[PDB]
Amino acid sequence: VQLQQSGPVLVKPGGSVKMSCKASEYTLTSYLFQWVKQKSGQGLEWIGYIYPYNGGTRYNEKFRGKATLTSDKSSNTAYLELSSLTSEDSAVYYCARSSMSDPGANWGPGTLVTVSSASTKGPSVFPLAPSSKSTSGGTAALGCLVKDYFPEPVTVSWNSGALTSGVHTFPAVLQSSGLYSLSSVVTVPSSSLGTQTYICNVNHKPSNTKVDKKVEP
Amino acid sequence: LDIQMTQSPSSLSASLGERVSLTCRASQEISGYLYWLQQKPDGTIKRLIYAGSTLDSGVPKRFSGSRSGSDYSLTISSLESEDFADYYCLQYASYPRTFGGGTKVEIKRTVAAPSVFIFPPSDEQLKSGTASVVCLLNNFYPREAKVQWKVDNALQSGNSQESVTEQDSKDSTYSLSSTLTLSKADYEKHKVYACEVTHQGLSSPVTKSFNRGECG
Numbered sequence: 151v152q153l154q155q156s157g158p159v160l161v162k163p164g165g166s167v168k169m170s171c172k173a174s175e176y177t178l179t180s181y182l183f184q185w186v187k188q189k190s191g192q193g194l195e196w197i198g199y200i201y202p203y204n205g206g207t208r209y210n211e212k213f214r215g216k217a218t219l220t221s222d223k224s225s226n227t228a229y230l231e232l233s234s235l236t237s238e239d240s241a242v243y244y245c246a247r248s249s250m251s252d253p254g255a256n257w258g259p260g261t262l263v264t265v266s267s268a269s270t271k272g273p274s275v276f277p278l279a280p281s282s283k284s285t286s287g288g289t290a291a292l293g294c295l296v297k298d299y300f301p302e303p304v305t306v307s308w309n310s311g312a313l314t315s316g317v318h319t320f321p322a323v324l325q326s327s328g329l330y331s332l333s334s335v336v337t338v339p340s341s342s343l344g345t346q347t348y349i350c351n352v353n354h355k356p357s358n359t360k361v362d363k364k365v366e367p
Numbered sequence: 368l369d370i371q372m373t374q375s376p377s378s379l380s381a382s383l384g385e386r387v388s389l390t391c392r393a394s395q396e397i398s399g400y401l402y403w404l405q406q407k408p409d410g411t412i413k414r415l416i417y418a419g420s421t422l423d424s425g426v427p428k429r430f431s432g433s434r435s436g437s438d439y440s441l442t443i444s445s446l447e448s449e450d451f452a453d454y455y456c457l458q459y460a461s462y463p464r465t466f467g468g469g470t471k472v473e474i475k476r477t478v479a480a481p482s483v484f485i486f487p488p489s490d491e492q493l494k495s496g497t498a499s500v501v502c503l504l505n506n507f508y509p510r511e512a513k514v515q516w517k518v519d520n521a522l523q524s525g526n527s528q529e530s531v532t533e534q535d536s537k538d539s540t541y542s543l544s545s546t547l548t549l550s551k552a553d554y555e556k557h558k559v560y561a562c563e564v565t566h567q568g569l570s571s572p573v574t575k576s577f578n579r580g581e582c583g
């Protein structure tokens with residue numbers, strides 16, 4: 151039940167981008183790959199399909215022939231290339247797989263493409279330390295400020311995924327500098343502060359940055 | 368002609384436990400080739416129904432789908448907090464595949480006042496020239512809230528930005544961050560940093576503050 155898609159990519163206007171979709175499990179069954187576009191905070195638009203079995207393809211005419219779908223049936227991998235890019239192509243692209251009698255059974259997680267002239271920049275990660283000023287009665291809030299990066303996205307986990315409850319990772323905000331920033335916070339028991347460590351795990355794949363920041367009271 | 372899927376309502380607010388139905392009208396005959404998907408705030412999309420009424424095997428029984436002439440419906444028998452999401456229909460009778468405009472399903476719940484927390488800039492950040500002071504409003508409802516900053520009792524303007532999460536999947540609340548950005552020199556020259564919060568859940572504004580001189 152897992153389709154894998156290539157990572158986020160920054161590309162310049164007038165260039166091109168090629169992303170991939172593949173089933174995670176060795177399969178051998180004949181699937182059809184459907185591709186869908188979603189601009190930030192907007193709806194869904196069908197892009198086209200590729201049937202690796204026979205190379206069949208079809209495209210939404212709205213794309214004006216800018217999209218090309220190909221595949222490597224040897225690895226059961228489908229690829230979507232977009233040409234002559236402009237900022238209207240900044241969007242998350244999704245693939246879904248269909249079988250005989252089983253339409254759109256599985257969806258990939260999407261690939262985030264940003265079309266921009268600006269250079270990638272990795273984030274600085276700063277602690278939001280718990281203190282009396284972030285402690286109720288028994289509950290303390292703490293977090294990490296992930297500042298000054300481009301393009302989106304960053305990912306944030308806590309304690310390598312062991313801490314998920316009470317976590318709020320805010321949507322990124324574009325600063326006047328043209329760089330993004332966000333904070334991820336979590337509430338935990340105050341009594342855990344002297345003994346349980348809290349580390350935010352931040353990844354910014356466009357700049358190949360990975361940082362693990364320990365947040366101390 | 369391309370098939371138009373007209374989805375309504377585009378936004379639906381509903382109490383927990385409520386039976387809610389979403390409608391998608393096909394502009395041409397799709398013969399039951401109607402698919403409904405759910406998209407969660409983190410971007411995850413999953414299949415709910417296909418062939419108009421067949422429930423995907425991993426979806427809870429409170430979801431069902433039906434057809435009445437050219438009208439297709441997705442109904443949730445009694446709404447749960449985890450159902451907060453955007454729902455879309457899609458026809459697969461013909462190409463191009465076409466989607467409904469979606470329905471954002473919002474959850475009505477009782478008023479909850481926020482817990483308010485404030486965080487001074489880290490010394491690590493100060494070493495780099497800029498200072499960010501963060502005020503967190505956690506787990507509140509409804510969404511309307513006002514946050515004001517005062518630095519040594521003077522109201523700030525223009526130097527803060529807010530970010531708000533989507534409704535929480537477990538308790539249907541929101542959280543909000545207000546970040547005040549100052550140069551390190553401006554931060555060091557002032558002393559009292561206060562975040563002032565107004566929300567329907569609070570009788571009077573709550574102010575959380577710290578004095579740079581004492582840490583947090």
Ligand SMILES: C[C@H](O)c1ccccc1
Pocket residue numbers: 184185186196246248253254402457458459464
């Ligand atoms: C079954 C239909 O062709 C579909 C499903 C998911 C995404 C795009 C198209």
